[PDB]
Design a protein around this motif. Sequence first.
Motif, PDB file in Angstrom:
ATOM      1  N   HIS A 190       0.951  -1.330   0.345  1.00 40.19           N
ATOM      2  CA  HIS A 190      -0.526  -0.027   0.178  1.00 40.19           C
ATOM      3  C   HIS A 190       1.223   1.500   0.182  1.00 40.19           C
ATOM      4  O   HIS A 190       0.418   2.253   1.572  1.00 40.19           O
ATOM      5  N   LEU A 191       1.518   1.671  -0.669  1.00 38.44           N
ATOM      6  CA  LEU A 191       3.018   2.245  -1.375  1.00 38.44           C
ATOM      7  C   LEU A 191       3.321   2.661  -2.684  1.00 38.44           C
ATOM      8  O   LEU A 191       2.654   1.817  -3.183  1.00 38.44           O
ATOM      9  N   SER A 192       3.331   4.008  -3.121  1.00 40.40           N
ATOM     10  CA  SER A 192       4.055   4.217  -4.315  1.00 40.40           C
ATOM     11  C   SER A 192       4.988   3.829  -4.505  1.00 40.40           C
ATOM     12  O   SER A 192       5.337   3.610  -3.389  1.00 40.40           O
ATOM     13  N   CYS A 193       5.684   3.169  -5.802  1.00 38.45           N
ATOM     14  CA  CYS A 193       6.539   2.608  -5.948  1.00 38.45           C
ATOM     15  C   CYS A 193       7.661   3.958  -5.521  1.00 38.45           C
ATOM     16  O   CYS A 193       9.201   3.530  -5.465  1.00 38.45           O
ATOM     17  N   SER A 194       6.806   4.590  -5.344  1.00 36.95           N
ATOM     18  CA  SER A 194       7.948   6.458  -5.464  1.00 36.95           C
ATOM     19  C   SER A 194       8.530   6.172  -4.151  1.00 36.95           C
ATOM     20  O   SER A 194       9.961   6.504  -4.200  1.00 36.95           O
ATOM     21  N   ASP A 221      10.517   3.357   4.066  1.00 36.74           N
ATOM     22  CA  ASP A 221       9.305   2.673   3.782  1.00 36.74           C
ATOM     23  C   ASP A 221       9.552   1.879   2.787  1.00 36.74           C
ATOM     24  O   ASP A 221       8.260   0.204   2.827  1.00 36.74           O
ATOM     25  N   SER A 222      10.533   1.424   2.364  1.00 35.58           N
ATOM     26  CA  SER A 222      11.575   0.314   1.502  1.00 35.58           C
ATOM     27  C   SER A 222      11.327  -0.937   2.592  1.00 35.58           C
ATOM     28  O   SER A 222      11.186  -2.370   3.011  1.00 35.58           O
ATOM     29  N   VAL A 223      11.871  -0.642   4.027  1.00 32.83           N
ATOM     30  CA  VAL A 223      11.787  -1.887   5.454  1.00 32.83           C
ATOM     31  C   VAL A 223      11.133  -2.048   5.223  1.00 32.83           C
ATOM     32  O   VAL A 223      10.637  -3.506   6.021  1.00 32.83           O
ATOM     33  N   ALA A 224       9.664  -0.969   5.536  1.00 27.95           N
ATOM     34  CA  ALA A 224       8.247  -1.497   6.050  1.00 27.95           C
ATOM     35  C   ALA A 224       8.041  -2.286   4.796  1.00 27.95           C
ATOM     36  O   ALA A 224       7.197  -3.318   5.268  1.00 27.95           O
ATOM     37  N   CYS A 225       7.792  -2.028   3.241  1.00 26.97           N
ATOM     38  CA  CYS A 225       7.527  -3.305   2.842  1.00 26.97           C
ATOM     39  C   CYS A 225       7.870  -4.336   2.079  1.00 26.97           C
ATOM     40  O   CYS A 225       7.705  -5.732   2.053  1.00 26.97           O
ATOM     41  N   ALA A 226       9.512  -4.912   3.226  1.00 28.29           N
ATOM     42  CA  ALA A 226      10.739  -5.359   2.631  1.00 28.29           C
ATOM     43  C   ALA A 226      10.129  -6.341   3.733  1.00 28.29           C
ATOM     44  O   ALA A 226       9.947  -7.616   3.878  1.00 28.29           O
ATOM     45  N   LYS A 227       9.373  -5.623   4.960  1.00 28.99           N
ATOM     46  CA  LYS A 227       8.583  -6.572   6.080  1.00 28.99           C
ATOM     47  C   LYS A 227       8.063  -7.575   5.531  1.00 28.99           C
ATOM     48  O   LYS A 227       7.878  -8.152   6.293  1.00 28.99           O
ATOM     49  N   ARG A 228       6.900  -6.519   4.937  1.00 32.79           N
ATOM     50  CA  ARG A 228       5.207  -7.000   4.256  1.00 32.79           C
ATOM     51  C   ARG A 228       5.983  -8.509   3.648  1.00 32.79           C
ATOM     52  O   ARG A 228       5.242  -8.910   3.851  1.00 32.79           O
ATOM     53  N   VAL A 229       6.808  -8.606   2.594  1.00 37.10           N
ATOM     54  CA  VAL A 229       6.863  -9.376   1.716  1.00 37.10           C
ATOM     55  C   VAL A 229       6.834 -10.265   2.060  1.00 37.10           C
ATOM     56  O   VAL A 229       6.756 -11.660   2.315  1.00 37.10           O
ATOM     57  N   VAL A 230       8.261 -10.856   3.393  1.00 33.70           N
ATOM     58  CA  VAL A 230       8.767 -11.233   4.185  1.00 33.70           C
ATOM     59  C   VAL A 230       7.562 -12.582   5.272  1.00 33.70           C
ATOM     60  O   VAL A 230       7.861 -13.054   5.599  1.00 33.70           O
ATOM     61  N   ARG A 231       6.212 -11.597   5.847  1.00 26.79           N
ATOM     62  CA  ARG A 231       5.385 -11.625   6.323  1.00 26.79           C
ATOM     63  C   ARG A 231       4.502 -12.659   4.843  1.00 26.79           C
ATOM     64  O   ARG A 231       4.293 -13.853   5.741  1.00 26.79           O
ATOM     65  N   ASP A 232       4.927 -13.378   3.972  1.00 22.24           N
ATOM     66  CA  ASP A 232       4.276 -14.260   3.230  1.00 22.24           C
ATOM     67  C   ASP A 232       4.832 -15.063   3.209  1.00 22.24           C
ATOM     68  O   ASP A 232       5.982 -15.725   4.183  1.00 22.24           O
ATOM     69  N   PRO A 233       4.022 -16.980   3.149  1.00 16.80           N
ATOM     70  CA  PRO A 233       4.960 -17.334   3.199  1.00 16.80           C
ATOM     71  C   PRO A 233       6.595 -18.380   2.983  1.00 16.80           C
ATOM     72  O   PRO A 233       7.630 -19.052   3.596  1.00 16.80           O
ATOM     73  N   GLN A 234       7.116 -17.068   1.424  1.00 19.24           N
ATOM     74  CA  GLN A 234       8.792 -17.592   1.551  1.00 19.24           C
ATOM     75  C   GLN A 234       9.136 -17.523   2.096  1.00 19.24           C
ATOM     76  O   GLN A 234      10.571 -16.967   1.559  1.00 19.24           O
ATOM     77  N   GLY A 235       9.269 -16.012   2.670  1.00 18.94           N
ATOM     78  CA  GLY A 235       9.802 -14.846   3.648  1.00 18.94           C
ATOM     79  C   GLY A 235      10.900 -14.662   2.794  1.00 18.94           C
ATOM     80  O   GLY A 235      10.764 -14.346   1.749  1.00 18.94           O
ATOM     81  N   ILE A 236      12.642 -14.295   3.365  1.00 21.15           N
ATOM     82  CA  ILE A 236      13.682 -14.224   2.214  1.00 21.15           C
ATOM     83  C   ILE A 236      13.838 -14.636   1.242  1.00 21.15           C
ATOM     84  O   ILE A 236      14.210 -13.760   0.489  1.00 21.15           O
TER      85      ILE A 236
END
Length: 130
Positions: free
Chosen positions: A78-82, A91-106
């Motif tokens: 829920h961020l503009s790619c900008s 914001d990149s950190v907030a999003c990277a955390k969001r990515v890893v909350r998914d099954p695949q993780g890192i």
Amino acid sequence: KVFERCELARTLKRLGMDGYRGISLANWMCLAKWESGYNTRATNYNAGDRSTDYGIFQINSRYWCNDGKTPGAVNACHLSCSALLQDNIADSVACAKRVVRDPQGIRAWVAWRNRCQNRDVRQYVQGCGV
């Protein structure tokens, strides 16, 4: 902004990345290193599926951020790619955390699998005081 190694290690630690979802800071460092060379304004267009990778973690527009020009894409962070191209990496950190909350993780990042997985990544944080 192009981060220097230890500068980035402490910046990431301050942002709560050390051990986030079981992922060590050294792993995040190896990820950033191989994804963008610690460069916050790095972008990579993927001609094959019309998506673009943004920022220090090279997060893809098909699922994570909105850039308005990726066909049928979603915006899970829920961020503009900008927001992923700022010198400030919150914001990149907030999003990277969001990515890893998914099954695949890192493992969500193929570069992590190619250059960090089952490798000696201690060298990324040595001497940084983290």
